């Protein structure tokens, strides 16, 4: 196991959004070229196991530690009666007081906040990406698909992502070999060799959000100057086409950063190796 790995994101212009917007409430258009300089990216979204070492190492307290709460699905025991902020949930207890993380260490870390986030990615020598990076990186060197892999959810028949199958909310089949989630080295890689950039957890990033984009061209963008919620990406192991078509990479959505909640993680990203 090398879950902190990173690897080598390529420099390159890339088409940011898209002028087919899927949900356009959340500003997806318009598509803009964006130039991005080489850097490094997490492999992998960061595991139970890697935050372990985080917390073991600064003795760091989450927010929702803190708080005292934070949002579960109810289908694994609000913004949706679905949504229940449960007392004890958290990190280590992820469903609330009486789950644990022992038998998922290579699962990724939950009920992170942005704050916790940076928090730990800064502690490991790296930081967040920008939505910029984050999109880049999930494209992985194709120009205008719906998915890191291309426009099929099911290239060859093989799930390439944790997503959700069935009726939601009500039922989810488990299709994929998954209903919560998966270990972060599941499934396939994308071309830059990154793993569950779509699915399974959702990933903050640094930006504040904003749905109001110029088709100006610009160079490592880092977002607006100032907001109130920070953008997340790339869906998580509850998204499906009929509510959530957010398992795409020009897809976006955003929480308050001291948000937390059962499908939301992060991985970081580095300027050079640390
Ligand atoms: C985080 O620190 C804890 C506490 O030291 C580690 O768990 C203990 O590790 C020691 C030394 O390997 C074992 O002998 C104990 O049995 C462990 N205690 C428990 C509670 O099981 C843990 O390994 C550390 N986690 C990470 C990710 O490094
Ligand atoms: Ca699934
Ligand atoms: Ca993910």
Known sequence: LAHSKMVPIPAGVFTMGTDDPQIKQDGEAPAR???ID?????????????????????????????????????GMLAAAPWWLPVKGANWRHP???????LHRPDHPVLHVSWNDAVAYCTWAGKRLPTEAEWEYSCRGGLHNRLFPW????????????????????????????????????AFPPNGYGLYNIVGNAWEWTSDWWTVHHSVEETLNPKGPPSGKDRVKKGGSYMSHRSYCYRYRCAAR??????????????????????
């Open 33 to 35: 070229r964006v130039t």
């Open 38 to 74: 080489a850097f490094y990216m997490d492999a992998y979204e960061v595991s139970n196991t890697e935050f372990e070492k985080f917390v073991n190492s600064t003795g760091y307290l989450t927010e929702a530690e803190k708080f005292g709460d934070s949002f579960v699905f109810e």
């Open 95 to 101: 469903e609330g007081p009486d789950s644990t993380i």
């Open 150 to 185: 291309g426009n099929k959810l099911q290239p060859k028949g093989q799930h390439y992502a944790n997503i959700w199958q069935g009726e939601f909310p009500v039922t989810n089949t488990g299709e994929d070999g998954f209903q919560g989630t998966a270990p972060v080295d």
């Open 253 to 274: 959505s955003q929480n308050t950063p001291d948000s937390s909640a059962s499908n939301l993680g992060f991985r970081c990203a580095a300027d050079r190796l640390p």
